[PDB]
A paper describes a structure:
The tumor suppressor protein p53 plays a pivotal role in several critical cellular processes, including cell-cycle regulation, DNA repair and apoptosis. Mutation of Tyr220 to Cys creates a narrow, hydrophobic pocket on the surface of the p53 DBD that reduces its thermal stability by approximately 4 kcal/mol. While wild-type p53 is moderately stable, melting at 44 °C, the Y220C mutant rapidly unfolds under physiological conditions, which effectively abrogates p53 signaling and drives tumorigenesis.
The same alignment highlighted a possible merging of the 4-fluorophenyl ring of 2 with the central iodinated scaffold of 4, therefore suggesting an aromatic ring at C5 as a possible substituent to grow 4 into subsite 2. The reason for this is unclear, but is likely to result from steric clashes arising from the dihedral angle between the two phenyl rings (θ ≈ 45°), as revealed by the crystal structure of bound 34. Despite its reduced potency, the binding mode of 34 was very similar to that of 9 and consistent with our initial merging strategy.
Residue numbers in the entry: 96 to 292
């Protein structure tokens, strides 16, 4: 009915990481550690790092799913709004209803859960490239937080799960997301609101 959001490093020490992009007016994606919140523009690249202490087995996968953050909306499926689901911006792989896409990975799979109707996107784990210490997934969010008939100004969380080949849980992390026109300004505003409180 509601997916768990409990942080769980698990046996492999799984956790996310984010770049330090700053809060200039021109920034397209920026992460606030104080808020545990990603701010991004519509359909722009959101780099999310995956970190582990030890290598999970071959066949491990990484899934992303959005849920509403407020408890009174958490049973509602997060989906694209009535406008964006019809705007024919498909990449050939993501269903037009899905909020979260993975960019530039032909092995991404998109699930419409047959029991919960929730959407998710899952990719195989791949080792870091030589010279790197982590792997990065590039996500896109395909509706604004404000879209009427969709998120409708309600905050969402993205839950990232590390899963075995059967889909069993190996690790979990999460972050809030706001999809907005000016992520740098909005991050600055919300961090100031937190400081004043
Ligand atoms: O250091 C490593 O060997 C390493 C290895 C993997 C990895 C590679 C292949 C596989 F099948 C399962 C896991 C990995 N990873 C990729 C997505 C989630 C974690 C990471 I981050 C690593 O740092
Ligand atoms: Zn929309």
């Amino acid at each position: 009915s509601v997916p768990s959001q409990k942080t769980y490093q698990g046996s492999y020490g799984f956790r996310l990481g984010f770049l330090h992009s700053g809060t200039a007016k021109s920034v397209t994606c920026t992460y606030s550690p104080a808020l545990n919140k990603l701010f991004c523009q519509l359909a722009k690249t959101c780099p999310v790092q995956l970190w582990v202490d030890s290598t999970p087995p071959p066949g491990t996968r990484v899934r992303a799913m959005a849920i509403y953050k407020q408890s009174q909306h958490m049973t509602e499926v997060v989906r694209r709004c009535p406008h964006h689901e019809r705007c024919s911006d498909s990449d050939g792989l993501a269903p037009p209803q899905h909020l979260i896409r993975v960019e530039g990975n032909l092995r991404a799979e998109y699930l419409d859960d047959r029991n919960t109707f929730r959407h998710s996107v899952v990719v195989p784990c791949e080792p870091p490239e030589v010279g790197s210490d982590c792997t990065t997934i590039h996500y896109n969010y395909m509706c604004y937080s404000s879209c009427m008939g969709g998120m409708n100004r309600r905050p969402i969380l993205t839950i990232i799960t590390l899963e075995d080949s059967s889909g069993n849980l190996l690790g979990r992390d999460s972050f809030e997301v706001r999809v907005c026109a000016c992520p740098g300004r909005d991050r600055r505003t919300e961090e100031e609101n937190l400081r004043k409180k």
